[PDB]
Amino acid sequence: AKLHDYYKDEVVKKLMTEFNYNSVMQVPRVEKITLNMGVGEAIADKKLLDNAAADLAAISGQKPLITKARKSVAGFKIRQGYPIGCKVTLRGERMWEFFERLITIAVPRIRDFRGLSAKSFDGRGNYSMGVREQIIFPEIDYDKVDRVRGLDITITTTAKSDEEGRALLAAFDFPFR
Amino acid sequence: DKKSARIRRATRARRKLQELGATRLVVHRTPRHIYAQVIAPNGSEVLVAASTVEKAIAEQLKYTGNKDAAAAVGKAVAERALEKGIKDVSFDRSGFQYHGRVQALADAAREAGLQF
Amino acid sequence: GSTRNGRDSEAKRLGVKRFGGESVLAGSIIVRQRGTKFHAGANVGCGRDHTLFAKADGKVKFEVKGPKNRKFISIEAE
């Protein structure tokens, strides 16, 4: 948690004069980072979900939760309660050490990088990026993979506007094309 | 919501409990000051109330709001219950998990002599 | 021509058997009903068919309680 000790008095201080809060509990703090890997093609192989969940066990630090299908749709041929993804809700201590590991040495490994979008906010302060490979994370051996598919990182904060959570990310410098 | 999710969690064993006319022991945990009181079977008047917000309890404890400060409540509720002739009660979790401080308040009540 | 209807069932004889203040000996069925249209209250039990049976040789009395106003059936004790 390098960039939590950084957060406690150089980003909290930074956002109290940008949006002139009267109370330190008004400052946007980040709550959780949820890593969905929407595998989709676990209809063919169940062990195709097992390699994909094994890649979240490396990109994150902990074992993923496989996600059942809420409804059942015949446009994709999935039944009710048939496993169709895997999520990692990392929060607390390991989400700071991931967010350190995300923006510093995993964003530069993205092939043909220009910047992250300044419009990938859902009107509440919650960012969502989506990567197209596993191999932007060094925890992949580059040889044990057999599928291109990446994941999407969602950063749920306690912000309120799209600007108020943009400015929280922008103090971690979070490149923003 | 944190609060009203627990009220409906508790209501199943409140309405069932007043259907038996039971003089009930109502515990109320908070991150400081676990509370406890004993309520008559009408539901409308109480008989015994002892808790660590009282100044005759908190002076003898270093922190009010841990397990041994919860065992100081359940002994004092049972010491005041037997004066009124209240032997038989029914414990009410009030939506709290019967695990930590609210177990010790029922432990120290069953140790001191509050029969249930 | 022909018809496709003409089918019904033995009327189940539901409803309230014992009304308001009308002494009922314990175990006396009061309301025979589909679901819990009328809910069980003081001294009155509810069966496996939502038949609220009396439990104490007394009166009856319907009410409305809580924040849902569900006719409720209690038993005054005389």
């Binding site: 630090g61 590991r101 964003v107 220009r114 060094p138 925890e139 490149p175 | - | -």
Partner: protein, 66 residues
């Protein structure tokens, strides 16, 4: 956190070409050798060579030679 179900989370020591030795916790294993990090990456010098690309009259007047 649970026992025995999670992968090992031993702290590593990263290193990129710029001398940026930076200790992080990960699950890689032994060590880690990097190309670029958030420091020394072509995001601030990269758009410097993106603005001045287009233009054709200055292309032509080098074939004018005067």
């Amino acid at each position: 956190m649970k026992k025995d179900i999670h992968p090992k989370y031993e702290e590593i020591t990263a290193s990129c070409s710029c001398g940026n030795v930076m200790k992080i916790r990960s699950t890689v294993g032994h060590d880690l050798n990097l190309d670029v990090c958030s420091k020394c990456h072509p995001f601030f010098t990269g758009k410097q060579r993106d603005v001045a690309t287009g233009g054709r009259v200055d292309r032509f007047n080098k074939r004018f030679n005067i």
